[PDB]
Design a protein around this ligand. Structure first.
Ligand SMILES: NC(=[NH2+])NCCCO
Lengths: 215, 209
DNA sequence: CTGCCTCAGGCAC
DNA sequence: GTGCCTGAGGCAG
């Protein structure tokens, strides 16, 4: 079901779409309150760029009035954050979409098999093959435990506030990374670790099949 | 960059409040977009170059390309594989990867993640095992990211001599071309978060010793 | 998908 | 920081 329109602040065209490939992203009031709250505390001018609004006369005043109507208070004098990154420009829907597409290219285009063959060839002495296999297996297990923790993150995103399944200490730390990255961070880290995991799988498989590979 | 080699300058898609100067897009970058594996057409390249959608704007861009010696036919179909990364100019793709690397280094909670994951393995008899698994992971990840750092895929106006053999270099170049340069440095950026966790987990284990 | 005409934001200041 | 006015691209169709 549709997000209640009363909980939607505006809709924002994606910055990274070619040829109208995506519908405008809905920006919830919850998302706006995340941007205005610690740790970023964006001001009217930075939030206007995130929402991709025209810089018109009294644009700041008109945005701060819109925020007052929904109960958010943004002081006119609030300091301009200097620790902004390229990720700060994103609305949460686009940030998550960008992480999903990163996941997609790491799964479908990253050359895990060629990388495995190259790195197996750098450590190809008979006397190191048992150690290399155990190191590859341990790396797979430690990486999976790490991505399994990130997958248990229940940071608020869009209009959802799911019940946390992690203890409040580690959840607040993961939420910090969610808020500075606009939701890109944990999923993009998991996307990259799939490329690593595919390399490790292909590396163990090429060791297993070494005889049939040389024929 | 020699102005003869600059096709056009493009404002960044991900800048807030005029934070970045326009990115130069070279002839060599446009040639990469027009060639396999992407083979962008006038309409997609127009969007990468952030050009107005005008009547016969396709025809103007194709005539601009023909003058600098790139052939883009009128009838070229849209590319088969388009992601959000396809919108990026190479300069902004590389900048975005470096920014991802900066937030992994400065905002990822490596110490809280290490404390939490160590606490899931508190059997006194598995600490030597866990320590070796963490060391093994740090070494395997480092060899992996050292390979990606030896990538000498052409970007912008640069065409450095490859240090890797041609087989592995063509496969890394494939990942460079579909990601417009973001891919390998972004994988490296994310492994920084993993490496800082592994560092903090070994340090916390050694403290408890 | 084409491309007009709104309005985002590049730019001067 | 402000906000005009050029031109990218959202949206109509
Ligand atoms: N990121 C920041 N804390 N910037 C300054 C915010 C204005 O109080």
């Amino acid at each position: 079901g549709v997000v209640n329109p009363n909980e939607v602040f505006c809709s924002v065209p994606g910055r990274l779409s070619l040829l109208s490939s995506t519908s405008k992203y809905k920006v919830t009031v919850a998302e706006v309150q995340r941007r205005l709250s610690p740790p970023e505390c964006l001001n009217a001018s930075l939030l206007g760029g995130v929402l991709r609004r025209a810089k018109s006369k009294n644009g700041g005043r008109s945005l701060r009035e819109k925020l007052d109507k929904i109960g958010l208070n943004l002081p006119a004098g609030r300091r301009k954050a200097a620790n902004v990154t390229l990720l700060t420009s994103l609305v949460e829907g686009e940030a998550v979409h960008l992480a999903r597409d990163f996941g997609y290219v790491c799964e479908t285009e990253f050359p895990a098999k060629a990388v495995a063959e190259f790195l197996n060839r750098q450590h190809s002495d008979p006397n190191e093959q048992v150690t290399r296999k155990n190191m590859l297996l341990a790396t797979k297990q430690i990486c999976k435990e790490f991505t399994d923790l990130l997958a248990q993150d229940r940071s608020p995103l869009g209009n959802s506030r799911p019940n946390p399944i992690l203890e409040p200490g580690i959840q607040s730390c993961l939420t910090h990374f969610n808020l500075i990255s606009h939701g890109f961070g944990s999923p993009a880290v998991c996307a990259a670790v799939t490329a690593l995991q595919n390399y490790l799988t292909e590396a163990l498989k090429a060791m297993d099949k070494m005889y049939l590979s040389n024929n």
